[PDB]
Every structure is written in structure tokens, then in C-alpha cells.
Write a protein that binds this ligand. Structure first.
Ligand SMILES: Nc1nc2c(ncn2[C@@H]2O[C@H](COP(=O)(O)O)[C@@H](O)[C@H]2O)c(=O)[nH]1
Ligand SMILES: [Mg+2]
Ligand SMILES: [Zn+2]
Length: 326
């Protein structure tokens, strides 16, 4: 069997060190890596966060789970594919390690964040929540138009975690498992950008008034939400060649949706979804950095000064895009 062969080869392979895989670097790139290499990188992330040892994960089970996750991202979507999910998880790993965020959270929270990052866009169809709503998608009906995609992504995450041979959370007690799934669900739902915009104000105000308290459960959940967003948008902080390449992937998906909107729904798409504005991608990226990213990475920097490289990377990309916009 082909799938059996893939798993037996992965499970028997040595897992290279974090150093060799460069996964502790905020400026990490997956572009020269094969699919197998990304899976090995993923095993190393779980291992170096002590999740394998601390939660008694069988090596074969972890390997099968990673392959299942990778297989459940679509191969015909330009941006919302396995590489995006993988890069999101690596940014989380780098934030927890080099960003020194791991000392502020428990092992169970770290377990949930890593799983959530890897699973956060599972089976993404390559269209937005609003498009699914306006086209009467079965997903929109099921989730009452609320964070439609994100609910779908969590459902897929749950489906995989429960499938035979993929149960990486079998070592958790029933109480721990209930708790972990709740954190994972909230973390995936947090990647809905509409929710980030809605709640970012409370987070920023807590930092401004020196009242940020991670012992408060509401604020802990809030922080996990902002971290998920920070990881999800982290391509905007990457070295220029990586950000230029990724931005074109994002535009590819957006423009394709816009073409469907114009033809099937008879509506003029917004600028970000309108192919006529391809020449304005630089101004649109600067606009996205100013409205969303800058303040998020500034806030994360106040939380942990070792997260400064994310803010620095974001600022450098704004300079690069603004030069092309002028
Ligand atoms: N304009 C713009 N939006 C982005 C970019 N990267 C992430 N996003 C925004 O943040 C959201 C992240 O959610 P995701 O697309 O991963 O499901 C995107 O849908 C999009 O609205 C970008 O490079 N440019
Ligand atoms: Mg998403
Ligand atoms: Zn995403």
C-alpha cells in the first residue's frame, strides 16, 4: 500500500535536530524543503516542546497524525495549503522558544497551541466566509454563518484526532482531554480575522495600563488568541523574497474569488479581490500592515522583548512594499 509505505518511511527516519532544521529562527523558510522534511520538522517541534515525553505519544501515532493533517489540506489552493499551516506552527514554535513565550504557559496550553496551529486551516476551500455565506454553502448553514471556515477547520481537526491510529491525545486523562479540546477550539476560532479586530482593543488596553495578567483566565484566552493571529499572519514579517512570494499566493486566491463574485454573484469585487488592482498590491500590503499587523507585533513585543524580530520584519516589509507603491 502507498499510504502505508509513506508512514513506514517517515516513522523509520531519524528526526534531525532543531538546529539542523533551522526551526528556532523567526526568519525560517520552507521553500527548499520537501513534504517529508516538513513532517520531520513537525515531529521535532512536538519533541523539543516536551510534548512527546510529557504526554506519552507513541512515535507511530504522531507520524500518522501529521500525515493525516497534511493530507487534509487541499492541493489545488494557492495559499491555504499545508505549507501555510506548517509555517504557522513553526512561527509558534519560534515564538515559544526564541520568543521565550513558553515560560508563560503550561504544557497543556502549548500542546493545544501547536495542534491548533497545524490544524487551523484544515480543508480550506480557498474562499472567504462571506463568499460561503453568499453562495449558500452547506458549511454556512451548519455553523449559522458564524466563523464558518474556522468551525469547519476545528471539526476536521477533531475528526483526525479521533480517527484510529491518529489519537495523539490518548495519554491525557478525560479531564485534560476536555480542557485541551476547548483550548484548541478557541485557538482555531481566534484565527477568524473578524474576531481579532473585535477583541484586539481589550488586549492593547491591558498592555497600555500595565494590567496584563496571565493568571486571569479571560486574559489567558485573549493572549492565546493574539498569539494565534500573530503566527497566522507571520509571512508579513519574513525576509523580503519570502514575503513577496507569499503575498502573490494570497492575491492569487483573492483574485480567483473575485472572478467568481463578478460572474456568479454579479457584484463588483472589493479591491483586494479585484484583479484590476494587481498593480496596487504594494499599496494594499502597506494598508494591511498599518491596519492590522503593526500594532499586533508591537503589543507582542511589549509582552516579550524577544518577539521584537517579528515587529522588525514587519516594518522592513512595509518599507519594501511602500517603495513599490510610490
Ligand atoms: N491583505 C492581506 N491579508 C492577509 C495577508 N495575509 C493574511 N491576510 C489576512 O488575514 C487572514 C488570515 O486568515 P487565513 O487566510 O489564514 O485563513 C486572511 O484571510 C486575510 O484576510 C496578506 O498578506 N495581505
Ligand atoms: Mg483561517
Ligand atoms: Zn491561516
Amino acid at each position: 500500500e502507498e499510504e502505508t509505505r509513506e508512514l513506514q518511511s517517515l516513522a523509520a527516519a531519524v528526526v534531525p535536530s532543531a538546529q539542523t532544521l533551522k526551526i528556532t529562527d523567526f526568519s525560517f523558510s520552507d521553500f527548499e524543503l520537501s513534504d517529508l522534511e516538513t513532517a520531520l520538522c513537525t515531529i521535532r517541534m512536538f519533541t523539543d516542546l516536551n510534548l512527546v515525553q510529557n504526554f506519552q505519544m507513541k512515535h507511530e501515532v504522531l507520524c500518522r497524525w501529521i500525515l493525516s493533517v497534511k493530507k487534509n489540506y487541499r492541493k489545488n489552493v494557492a495559499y491555504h495549503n499545508w505549507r501555510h499551516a506548517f509555517n504557522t506552527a513553526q512561527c509558534m514554535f519560534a515564538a515559544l522558544k526564541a520568543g521565550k513565550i513558553q515560560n508563560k504557559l503550561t504544557d497543556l496550553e502549548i500542546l493545544a497551541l501547536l495542534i491548533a496551529a497545524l490544524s487551523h486551516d484544515l480543508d480550506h476551500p480557498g474562499v472567504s466566509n462571506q463568499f460561503l455565506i453568499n453562495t449558500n454553502s452547506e458549511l454556512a448553514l451548519m455553523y449559522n454563518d458564524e466563523s464558518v471556515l474556522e468551525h469547519h477547520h476545528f471539526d476536521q481537526c477533531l475528526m483526525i484526532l479521533n480517527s484510529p491510529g491518529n489519537q495523539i491525545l490518548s495519554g491525557l486523562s478525560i479531564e485534560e482531554y476536555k480542557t485541551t479540546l476547548k483550548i484548541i477550539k478557541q485557538a482555531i476560532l481566534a484565527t477568524d480575522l473578524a474576531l481579532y479586530i473585535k477583541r484586539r482593543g481589550e488586549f492593547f488596553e491591558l498592555i497600555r495600563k500595565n494590567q496584563f495578567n496571565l493568571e486571569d483566565p479571560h486574559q489567558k484566552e485573549l493572549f492565546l488568541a493574539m498569539l494565534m493571529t500573530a503566527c497566522d499572519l507571520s509571512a508579513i514579517t519574513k525576509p523580503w523574497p519570502i514575503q513577496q512570494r507569499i503575498a502573490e499566493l494570497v492575491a492569487t486566491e483573492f483574485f480567483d474569488q473575485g472572478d467568481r463574485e463578478r460572474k456568479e454573484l454579479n457584484i463588483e469585487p472589493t479591491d483586494l479581490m479585484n484583479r484590476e488592482k494587481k498593480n496596487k498590491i504594494p499599496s494594499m500590503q502597506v494598508g494591511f500592515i498599518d491596519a492590522i499587523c503593526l500594532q499586533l507585533y508591537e503589543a507582542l513585543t511589549h509582552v516579550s522583548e524577544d518577539c521584537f524580530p517579528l515587529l522588525d520584519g514587519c516594518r522592513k516589509n512595509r518599507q519594501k512594499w511602500q517603495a513599490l507603491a510610490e
